[PDB]
């Protein structure tokens with residue numbers, strides 16, 4: 001029993017969750033194309049179903065989030081984390097051994113449930129173990145940076161491993177890593193609820209800004225590989241590599257602008273980030289080769305880093321100013337915003353790409369971001 | 385008689401016209417203040433009249449512009465140019481000796497008529513003298529360079545000279561320069577009309593682009609000095625110097641982006657420059673000292689330079705692609721945009737500032753520019 005073991009456990013759990021989220025994007029469209037028969041343009045018939053597949057995790061996470069907290073209060077913290085590891089291992093094995101469409105849907109649903117359980121339980125355990133105030137910050141920083149590390153490491157992993165070792169290599173590797181995390185976890189040892197926090201306009205503006213900024217990436221996952229295979233004629237191992245700028249630029253932007261944004265005002269950072277997201281999504285569907293998506297994706301990642309570094313401190317400041325705040329107050333609002341974006345984006349986006357073209361979806365999302373960007377003016381000098 | 389005299393005549397005429405347009409900015413409100421009266425404040429009662437006074441030039445420029453063409457065809461070019469000198473000299477003398485509000489109105493009106501006549505006749509004479517189709521570009525370029533140069537030394541001239549020499553000095557100097565231009569002038573010697581060009585959407589979008597880009601500076605003239613004397617409490621000689629960044633930044637931006645815009649697309653330059661304007665007009669009314677306007681004014685000038693350097697070649701290309709083009713079709717389409725901007729901006733700005741607050745006007749203009757910015761996506765790849 002030591003304070004570092006819980007940190008390493010939460011680190012590995014969040015890394016595994018984000019890696020399993022990201023790895024699926026290069027793999028599902030390629031597998032669905034391969035099972036029927038770069039050859040054919042029949043993917044338009046399946047776009048609504050591939051889009052609805054991705055939203056299952058967000059929908060189940062939203063459905064299961066409110067019940068997690070009371071369970072942790074009445075039966076502790078370790079058992080919900082063990083449940084999360086078991087569900088994650090079941091999800092990864094089901095992904096590895098699935099052959100049809102329904103099995104992948106079940107895998108995504110189970111992954112959503114396990115992710116919600118593991119996230120809430122791990123945050124609770126890290127809060128409970130450290131009781132120094134200042135120390136909690138350096139622990140939460142490392143644990144939350146683990147998510148970005150997993151996102152960076154796992155984006156081109158699946159696409160490269162699918163065409164070389166097979167369809168069951170990355171999922172079994174993630175299963176072994178989850179088994180290691182579970183084995184490590186085997187050796188261990190209030191105020192203003194969220195629905196009141198979402199009742200004031202100042203928090204709602206920030207949450208909507210975060211959701212609309214992340215919908216650029218939310219609706220680019222299930223629709224970009226299909227677009228690449230239909231038009232660009234790129235090989236199957238480069239589909240995951242097109243998302244590397246979206247992660248590297250995000251990490252660079254979040255570090256640099258967490259350093260710099262306090263000097264020139266946070267609302268200006270949010271406005272410029274939203275505008276850059278809109279312009280980047282507008283310029284995305286003009287590329288005729290894989291090298292042409294290096295620019296717009298990088299700009300997109302930089303603008304999302306802009307918004308995510310300029311909005312969280314504003315949310316914390318508002319919660320401290322007008323309500324009573326706890327350690328995880330900002331986390332619940334951020335998670336609700338992310339899940340709402342990931343659950344509303346793909347489900348409507350698939351319908352839009354069947355009804356009309358893929359570029360019109362990008363133009364619509366960019367225009368929505370640009371129109372919403374002026375509304376960040378409200379956040380400056382928030383009244384008590 | 386030669387070909388380098390007409391160039392200097394058109395140069396001096398455009399230079400003096402722009403100086404007389406710009407030097408009235410910090411003289412009218414200060415004259416009203418020191419004729420009606422730290423300082424008791426009532427300028428909110430007269431802001432509407434001050435705003436309406438500035439629109440007369442644009443209004444009867446638009447009213448008189450259609451009639452100058454057939455007159456030039458029937459009776460030549462030199463006589464309408466000499467009439468411009470006579471009307472401009474009358475306007476500057478009237479500005480020098482005016483004491484009441486009606487005289488300033490009629491002087492501005494005369495300046496509008498003289499500016500329209502001088503501009504049309506001068507461009508006609510420059511086109512008539514040169515008939516090489518290569519040196520004509522340099523001939524227009526020098527005159528428009530003088531047009532740009534006037535607005536640099538026009539704004540921080542009246543404000544500085546007013547508090548040190550008096551109210552009758554700069555107008556008399558401009559009158560002497562006008563008489564010199566007339567003395568120089570004394571020793572001298574068709575397709576797709578405009579109303580059909582304003583019928584296709586691809587030109588109307590560009591015209592609205594230029595107009596809504598210049599409305600930010602159009603509504604900033606009559607209302608910024610009054611705001612400065614009401615809040616910032618600056619001396620009377622610093623009102624004119626607050627517009628120098630909007631001139632220098634505009635010149636720098638127009639040079640750089642005329643060099644650079646073709647590499648990254650003209651529509652993207654316009655889209656980026658219509659958002660810098662919206663942010664600049666939003667950060668303008670937050671300053672609490674004179675030194676806080678150096679940033680937003682420079683940004684506004686840079687964005688206007690971006691738009692004006694990325695839109696004119698688009699208009700020329702569109703007119704060549706879909707219609708029949710002449711020497712100054714882009715000139716006419718730009719004039720109809722500038723005059724509409726200067727005629728619609730100040731009046732409604734005065735009404736808004738007397739109805740709601742001054743900062744709300746800049747917020748509305750910035751929101752309008754941001755909303756209209758996505759519509760520049762249409763201008764890429766226009767069909768034939």
Ligand SMILES: COC(=O)[C@H]1[C@H]2C[C@@H]3c4[nH]c5cc(OC)ccc5c4CCN3C[C@H]2C[C@@H](OC(=O)c2cc(OC)c(OC)c(OC)c2)[C@@H]1OC
Nearest residue numbers: 021022025144147217243246247250304312330331334335
């Ligand atoms: C699945 O990806 C995630 O799930 C994370 C990211 C979401 C999004 C994203 N997805 C991609 C998928 C790709 O595959 C092809 C490629 C690129 C991207 C990008 C690029 C852009 N990107 C940003 C990532 C943001 C992460 O969230 C946090 O960093 C965070 C930080 C906090 O501390 C301040 C929080 O506390 C308040 C917090 O509360 C919930 C969350 C978020 O959840 C952990």
Ligand SMILES: COC(=O)[C@H]1[C@H]2C[C@@H]3c4[nH]c5cc(OC)ccc5c4CCN3C[C@H]2C[C@@H](OC(=O)c2cc(OC)c(OC)c(OC)c2)[C@@H]1OC
Nearest residue numbers: 405406409528539601627630631634688696714715718719
């Ligand atoms: C009165 O100001 C004008 O009247 C000129 C400018 C309008 C606007 C402006 N006003 C100010 C007043 C101030 O006092 C306090 C301070 C700052 C500014 C700024 C800063 C920003 N600025 C830009 C200036 C632009 C000029 O117009 C052209 O340069 C032009 C070029 C062309 O060549 C391509 C044309 O041909 C197609 C053309 O056709 C009609 C016009 C325009 O008309 C001549």
